[PDB]
Every structure is written in structure tokens, then in C-alpha cells.
Design an enzyme around this catalytic site. Sequence first.
Site, PDB file in Angstrom:
ATOM      1  N   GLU B  16       0.853  -1.165   0.000  1.00  9.95           N
ATOM      2  CA  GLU B  16       0.000   0.000   0.000  1.00  9.95           C
ATOM      3  C   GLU B  16       0.907   1.238   0.000  1.00  9.95           C
ATOM      4  O   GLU B  16       1.766   1.415   0.830  1.00  9.95           O
ATOM      5  CB  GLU B  16      -0.934   0.018   1.195  1.00  9.95           C
ATOM      6  CG  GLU B  16      -2.066   1.045   1.199  1.00  9.95           C
ATOM      7  CD  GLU B  16      -1.689   2.510   1.271  1.00  9.95           C
ATOM      8  OE1 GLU B  16      -2.171   3.389   0.537  1.00  9.95           O
ATOM      9  OE2 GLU B  16      -0.669   2.689   1.968  1.00  9.95           O
ATOM     10  N   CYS B  63      -6.069   4.604   5.698  1.00  4.65           N
ATOM     11  CA  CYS B  63      -5.758   3.422   4.933  1.00  4.65           C
ATOM     12  C   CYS B  63      -7.003   2.523   4.733  1.00  4.65           C
ATOM     13  O   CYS B  63      -7.739   2.224   5.681  1.00  4.65           O
ATOM     14  CB  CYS B  63      -4.676   2.668   5.652  1.00  4.65           C
ATOM     15  SG  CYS B  63      -4.105   1.201   4.683  1.00  4.65           S
ATOM     16  N   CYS B  66      -5.690  -1.689   5.512  1.00  2.00           N
ATOM     17  CA  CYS B  66      -6.031  -1.885   6.918  1.00  2.00           C
ATOM     18  C   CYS B  66      -7.236  -1.021   7.274  1.00  2.00           C
ATOM     19  O   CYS B  66      -7.263  -0.278   8.213  1.00  2.00           O
ATOM     20  CB  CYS B  66      -4.854  -1.663   7.835  1.00  2.00           C
ATOM     21  SG  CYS B  66      -4.160  -0.002   7.897  1.00  2.00           S
ATOM     22  N   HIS B  70      -8.116   1.958  11.891  1.00  2.00           N
ATOM     23  CA  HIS B  70      -8.012   3.313  12.416  1.00  2.00           C
ATOM     24  C   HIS B  70      -9.319   3.812  12.993  1.00  2.00           C
ATOM     25  O   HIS B  70      -9.269   4.624  13.928  1.00  2.00           O
ATOM     26  CB  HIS B  70      -7.475   4.277  11.338  1.00  2.00           C
ATOM     27  CG  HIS B  70      -6.066   3.992  10.938  1.00  2.00           C
ATOM     28  ND1 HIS B  70      -4.998   4.513  11.685  1.00  2.00           N
ATOM     29  CD2 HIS B  70      -5.526   3.272   9.931  1.00  2.00           C
ATOM     30  CE1 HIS B  70      -3.878   4.108  11.119  1.00  2.00           C
ATOM     31  NE2 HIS B  70      -4.186   3.349  10.023  1.00  2.00           N
ATOM     32  N   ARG B 461      -0.374  -5.039  10.697  1.00  2.00           N
ATOM     33  CA  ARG B 461       1.043  -4.664  10.564  1.00  2.00           C
ATOM     34  C   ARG B 461       1.687  -4.279  11.912  1.00  2.00           C
ATOM     35  O   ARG B 461       2.879  -3.982  11.922  1.00  2.00           O
ATOM     36  CB  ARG B 461       1.200  -3.545   9.507  1.00  2.00           C
ATOM     37  CG  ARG B 461       0.828  -4.067   8.121  1.00  2.00           C
ATOM     38  CD  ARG B 461       0.499  -2.932   7.128  1.00  2.00           C
ATOM     39  NE  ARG B 461       0.033  -3.628   5.930  1.00  2.00           N
ATOM     40  CZ  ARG B 461      -1.190  -4.109   5.763  1.00  2.00           C
ATOM     41  NH1 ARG B 461      -2.157  -3.959   6.675  1.00  2.00           N
ATOM     42  NH2 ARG B 461      -1.485  -4.760   4.659  1.00  2.00           N
ATOM     43  N   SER B 484       3.472   0.858  10.357  1.00  2.00           N
ATOM     44  CA  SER B 484       4.488   1.083   9.315  1.00  2.00           C
ATOM     45  C   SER B 484       5.352   2.289   9.634  1.00  2.00           C
ATOM     46  O   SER B 484       6.449   2.355   9.056  1.00  2.00           O
ATOM     47  CB  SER B 484       3.823   1.202   7.947  1.00  2.00           C
ATOM     48  OG  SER B 484       3.230   0.015   7.516  1.00  2.00           O
ATOM     49  N   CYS B 528       2.799  -0.215   4.525  1.00  2.00           N
ATOM     50  CA  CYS B 528       1.580   0.562   4.270  1.00  2.00           C
ATOM     51  C   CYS B 528       1.962   2.027   4.424  1.00  2.00           C
ATOM     52  O   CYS B 528       2.122   2.482   5.550  1.00  2.00           O
ATOM     53  CB  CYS B 528       0.497   0.057   5.228  1.00  2.00           C
ATOM     54  SG  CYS B 528      -1.091   0.768   4.735  1.00  2.00           S
ATOM     55  N   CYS B 531      -0.683   4.540   5.736  1.00  2.00           N
ATOM     56  CA  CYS B 531      -0.626   4.346   7.168  1.00  2.00           C
ATOM     57  C   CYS B 531       0.576   5.058   7.785  1.00  2.00           C
ATOM     58  O   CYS B 531       0.465   5.796   8.746  1.00  2.00           O
ATOM     59  CB  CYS B 531      -0.514   2.854   7.518  1.00  2.00           C
ATOM     60  SG  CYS B 531      -2.173   2.151   7.811  1.00  2.00           S
TER      61      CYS B 531
END
Lengths: 267, 534
Positions: B16, B63, B66, B70, B461, B484, B528, B531
Site C-alpha cells: 500500500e 488506509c 487496513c 483506524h 502490521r 508502518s 503501508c 498508514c
Amino acid sequence: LMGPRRPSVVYLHNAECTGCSESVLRAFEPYIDTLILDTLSLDYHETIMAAAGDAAEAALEQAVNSPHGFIAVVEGGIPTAANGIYGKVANHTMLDICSRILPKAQAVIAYGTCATFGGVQAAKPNPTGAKGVNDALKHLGVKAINIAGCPPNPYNLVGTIVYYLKNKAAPELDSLNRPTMFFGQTVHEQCPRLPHFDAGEFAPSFESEEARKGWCLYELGCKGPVTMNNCPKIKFNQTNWPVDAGHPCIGCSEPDFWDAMTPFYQN
Amino acid sequence: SSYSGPIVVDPVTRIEGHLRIEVEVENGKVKNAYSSSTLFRGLEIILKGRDPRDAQHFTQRTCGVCTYTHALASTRCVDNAVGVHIPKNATYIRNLVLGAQYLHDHIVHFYHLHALDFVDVTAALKADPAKAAKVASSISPRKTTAADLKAVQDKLKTFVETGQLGPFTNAYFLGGHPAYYLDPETNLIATAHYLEALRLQVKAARAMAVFGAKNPHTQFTVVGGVTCYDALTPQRIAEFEALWKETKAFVDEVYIPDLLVVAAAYKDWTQYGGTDNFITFGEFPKDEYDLNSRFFKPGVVFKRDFKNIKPFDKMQIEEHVRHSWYEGAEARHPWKGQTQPKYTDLHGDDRYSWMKAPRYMGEPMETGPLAQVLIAYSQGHPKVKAVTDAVLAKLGVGPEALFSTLGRTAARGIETAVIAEYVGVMLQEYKDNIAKGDNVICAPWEMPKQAEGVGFVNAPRGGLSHWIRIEDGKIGNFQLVVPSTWTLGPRCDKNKLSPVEASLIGTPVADAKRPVEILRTVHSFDPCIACGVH
Ligand code: SF4
Ligand code: SF4
Ligand code: F3S
Ligand SMILES: [Mg+2]
């Protein structure tokens, strides 16, 4: 990457969260494998393509320069502040990439509210000067079909592509350049809670018995009345949509919704 | 001798977001690396002054890979700031949607993002499908026949012969490549399962929408709990359970056996991509205010000392900007965070990324499946111990094998298998609780004028945290510190290489024009960048 018999698609990622790309992977009847193997030739797509780096750049140039023509699908807003510096791919600004490639496309589809209208990074105070594709590239004559939502229903992307391939032209578009076949009704006029709205039967809180009983979410902020989308009709993932999950619509297919529709829990 | 010189990989695809990797190679081995994230959006700047209830809708758009994570982190954060204790059922439903997210995410990562680094799809065309079917049937209780695999081969044959290779255009394996090892039949099994995974993931994502309205970007969380009264019904629970069961079968019968076959073929990859330090936040709480109530527990490990797991102290996080495109050089704890962009171009003033550089007690920390698995194993987690031991035994390797690109990839499968089973336990508990007559899913709460809050999620992640300062009932500061960011952020003001940068040192590169070995390690962290930078 292409030439022959399947129409070429070049899929670009600007300032985006990749939710719009994920939404296409949820394609149903046809599924995404049918779409990539039978319907279309997906000739550039950073999320799933095998090539990286120089090899990916070369794949992109081969697709865009093809004498057979290509369709561009664009995800994400274009950051324009500071001469485009806030977003680069292969050390080129997204603004420059899109300025060079999109005028060569036979058709451009802006997919998701970020690409159509600027989206989440364009919300106040818009530090990166993010713009939707048609706003950013007005001066180059680009007129992308706008398929809005955050992310859109992938039904609406595949429906627009299929129409285009059949009829060699865009379908009827509204004044925001969105296909009227998908965006011609408010989500509210299609909502199952409309009889409660009409009766003034509103949930006062999410923990209330009115919410348990499925009363209208307008007092809790629902933007269904001012949002054009086909959510209640098509649903998502073949199974649900926000107000059937008990939560108000946040207006996510509308321009500037992050600023126009907020606070999300007020009307 | 071999290649000496720079290599740049920009774009890094099959991640991503927008990543530029730069390495210096000497005699065919990487001697230095830079992780450069090349898009900034500034969601923390945009949140300032807004209603704290709105934060989760904005931050979810950090994101869409994922997705949900969030929204969950911001809702945990504002739940914490307001002091609300959400009902047991909201915790169950939130946890179940999160478990479904992990299964979707890791299955797509292994097949659709990682596997093209290890699978030559075009070599599948030369395979013997009868031989491939016997191999597939020996590694899985699922029986595969020659006709099954011939169908895939015929489809691929028609695709390749059209000359329109699409997403396989310019693949590093085209023509053959010395770092690609699989035989034709294993390439065909992996390719068959890549294609199968494209439809299975639809079901895995649908499971999230059953309770959570839609995927991507769910819409069922609120401060105080969840909104989805329909999630209490036997019909929705049955629909989720059928999708989960099918997804778990795929994990157990297709993904893990494939992971093990590929890992066995690439056992030299136990020698590259290791890291020193690990951080994890725990996930799947019984108590929203106690990380140690989570099915996976938080922890911190330095220099692979797993006999001495350190408690996680959330005050020891600081985010560095000295090698990032932000003003100045001062690291900040996220409750005193600053997001002041200032671009200097690549390596201008020694800055080369839009990610900040989180450090824990000043150290760079890997987070993600390898941290969650190794730390849970070392805490005596019985389910993690049982499947990581089974995986080690199948591969015929020792535990030090795990400190590697191969081990990280295997850990992603281990955690998927363990979470797929735990989702069933959570589901039963949820059913049990409904049966006791608990039908409550949201609790009332009041907005304080002044407060601080933090929400912790262990995402696919790794350790995710959202941090809020409420001032006048509005967002005074909102900071995201994302997995990330930890793993792929740049160097800090002590010039310590981040986990991805450090892990790249020693990578062999057989062909500088097709540097698949760099992608194998970078992809093993599942980057990501939307992210990491937000
Ligand atoms: S429109 Fe929404 S889902 Fe799509 S890229 Fe933008 S923020 Fe992500
Ligand atoms: S819940 Fe929203 S879309 Fe439905 S009737 Fe009420 S205001 Fe309209
Ligand atoms: S939030 Fe978006 S997904 Fe549909 S229900 Fe409202 S337009
Ligand atoms: Mg941050």
C-alpha cells in the site's frame, strides 16, 4: 502488457488510502479475476502489478503510448501545493504524471471522492493543496467521469466501464459529472427508515430503544437526505450498508463532504 | 566482481502507498539502505479543531487496506478520553470485525502482494498438472485433481498467448531469474491458489460487512460502543459464522500449506532480513482499559532477549523528525506531537521521508506479525506456541530461523491461523452473552471540555496508537503513530537505521536490474505508506 483484443486500463494512484483499489477487488458477478483475465487488460496498477521500479515505469510508458489506446482509472486527489512536491512517484510529482498521461487517455474515470472532488486530504485546511482530477486538470481539457464515494460501490465502476465499452461513450452524467444511472437518487429516498422520517420517529441516541427498533437516524446526523448514491439499492459486499448497520450516512459521495457534512453527528 | 553501485526501487509495487527504496550495493550485497515515503496527506493537521466524534471517520481514511483499524483506534482513543466503558457486546463485535480484518488482510498480502516475489506464474504453463495435483494433495487435506489444475493452466495459457500480460508485464521472473527457485508444478499450485484467493477474499471481507455495514471503510462504531442492533440477530451471526468458517478453511487448507511449501524451497531466506528489537500492543481485549486482558498481550523486546520481555510503557514513545521532511529535529511524545511539514527533497539536509521515526526508549522497533508472534510465544501463549512449534518442525529449522525475512513471512501465517481459530472462541462467547439476555451494544457518555486519551490496536502490521488532547471539547491535538511508521520510518536523531533499513543490509542481489531480493525483504514487513505517513 497489452495491444490485442482486451481494452487496456492504466490505473493510477495519487493521494489515496487504497480503499478505492480494495473496493474493486470486492467486485461480484463479475469478480475481479474475470475482469482482469477476460474483460479488460489491467496494464498498470501499483498495488498488484509484478514489476517494480524501472520495470514498472517501463510498463506504464508502454501502456500509455500504445497505438491501441487506453482507459485511465484514477484513485486519489492530486496534491498541487508547493508545485506538487507532497506526492511523487518515481520522483515525478503526481500533478506532472497526471498532466502528461490523462490527456492521452481515450477516457478517464475518476474513482472515489478523492479523485472526483479532492477528498479527505482536501479537507480544511488542505495542507497539500489537494484537488480532484477535473479541477486540477481543467486547463488540459481533461473531463473524467466521476464515480464518487469513499470508497464508491464497485458496482458503479464496473457498470460505467461496461457501458463505455459497449456504447463507445459515457453514460448520462449529472452536474458533478457522475453517472445518473447510479447517482440519480438520494440515498434517503431509497432508505428503509423513510416511513419513520415521515412520521417524525427519530432515534435520540444510539443506545436508545428507538435506535434498537430501527427509527430514523436524522437527529443523529444522517446525511442521507443530501447525498446521491445507490447504497440502499445495491448495498455493499452483497449484504449491508451504513444505516442498516444502525449508523448515519456521512455523505461520502458528495464534494467537500468532510467539511460540508461535519459535525457528522449533527443536523 | 558482482554489481557495485546504487539501486533504486521507485515505485515499490505490491504494497500500500508510495515507497521509494534506495540501496548501496557492494560486491552483490546491500551495504546501506534508505526508506523514503513519498506521499504526505496531513490528516493530523486536518483534524485540528474538529469534533472528537468525527475523528474516526477521517482517520479511517488513513488506509483502506487496513480498513477499520483506524476507526477502531480512534474510537478506542475517544472512548478512553471520555472515560466510557463500552458494553461487553460492543467489545465482542468490535473484536470480531477486527479478527475478520486480519484474515482478509493477511490472505491478500501473501498471495496478491508477496507471492509474485517467489512464484514464476509463466513457468506454471510448463508444469505437469497431474504431478502438480499429487503435490497439492500431499500438503493439504484438500484433494486437488489434475483436471482442477489443468483448468487453471488452460486459462493462464489463453491469457499469456494473447500477448497482454497485464499485471505480469515486465515481471522480474519473465525469461527466468536466478533468484526464482520453484519448479513448474509448485508455481502452478501457487498460481491456482492466487486465483482462488481472489474470490475467497470477497467472502473474508464480506464477513466484516455483516456487522460493520461495508468493506472497505466500516460504519458501525461510535463512542460508547457500536450501532448495529442487527448484529444481535441469529441470522446475522449465522451469516458471519458461515463466512468465517469458509475463510478459516482456506487459511488452514490453502494458505498455510502453500506458505510452508514456499518457505521450504527458499530456506536460504532464513539468512536475510533479521532485526533486533520488537514492540507489540496486544489485541482482542476482555477489558478495554487493560492491555494485559487481551488475547495477545503487549510487550517490548530488545536485542532478541525474549527471556526478558519488558512491560510496554506508552510514555517511552517519541517520534523523530531529524531525517524526515518536518521542521527541526526535536522528537516528540505523541501527546506533545507536532506535524509541521517542511520538504527538502531527497537527502536534502539529510532528510528523505515523509514518515516520522518512532523510537521506544530511543531504539528502532519492528512491529507486526513477527513481534506479536514472538512476544506471545515468549509469554507462554499456548495457541501461538503450538502452531509456531508445528511450523518450525515442518520446516526442519530452529527458532533462530524466525529472525529473518522467511521467519517474518511465516509469522504472518502463524498469526492468521491462530486468529482464525480465536474468532470462533470470540463468536461463541458473544453468542453466550446474548443468551444470558445481554442485548446492550452502546453506553451513554459525556464529552469533557479537557481530556487526554489514547487508543491502542494491534493491527495486521502491528502496534497502532491514536492520541488525543481535547481542549474546549474539540480536537486540540490528534496524533497517529502507526505500525508502518515504526517499521519503515527513516533514521532518528541518533542516526539509528529503522527496522526495514537495517534488515536490508546483507541482502544479496543477483541481478541489479531485477532486484527481487530487495522486494522479498521489504514485502515481508507488509508496508503501508498511507498508514505510515497519514
Ligand atoms: S475516496 Fe476514500 S476510500 Fe477512496 S482513496 Fe479517497 S479516502 Fe480512500
Ligand atoms: S436514516 Fe437517514 S437516509 Fe434513512 S430515512 Fe432517516 S435521514 Fe433518511
Ligand atoms: S456514507 Fe457513503 S457509502 Fe453510502 S450510505 Fe452514505 S453515501
Ligand atoms: Mg503521526
